[PDB]
Amino acid sequence: SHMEQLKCCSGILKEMFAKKHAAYAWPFYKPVDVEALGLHDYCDIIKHPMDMSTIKSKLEAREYRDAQEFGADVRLMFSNCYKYNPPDHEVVAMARKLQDVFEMRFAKM
Ligand SMILES: COc1cc(=O)n(C)nc1-c1ccccc1Oc1ccccc1
Numbered sequence: 001s002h003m004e005q006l007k008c009c010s011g012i013l014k015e016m017f018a019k020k021h022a023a024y025a026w027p028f029y030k031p032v033d034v035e036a037l038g039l040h041d042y043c044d045i046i047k048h049p050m051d052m053s054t055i056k057s058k059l060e061a062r063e064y065r066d067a068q069e070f071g072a073d074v075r076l077m078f079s080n081c082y083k084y085n086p087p088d089h090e091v092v093a094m095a096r097k098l099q100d101v102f103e104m105r106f107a108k109m
Helices: 002-016 019-028 052-060 067-084 090-108
Strands: none
Touching (some): 002 019, 002 052, 019 067, 067 090
């Protein structure tokens, strides 16, 4: 059911916020600070920013009809990171480590 599915999504996002993954998850906790040095072009490249705190707020406001809608925002968050940064950037390796956590849980729910 969609209700149980969404409860599982909340559980996946709670693990993504956990201390276990904090060493690589922290760039994704809050919206990208577009005022920070080096990020002056973020809004020109990334048309739909997304982060974990925004996804948590959307789950709380019932903005996802189902797990597929939630999963689309988590994957949008990673895709933004892959699109914006050079492929060898430290933040892309962190996105991949976090996406490993997400994909494994999302597949097994
Ligand atoms: C290029 O900076 C980013 C691109 C991006 O896609 N995200 C999601 N966040 C950032 C970012 C923003 C502010 C501070 C640090 C940041 O990440 C870094 C992580 C490791 C090394 C350097 C930067």
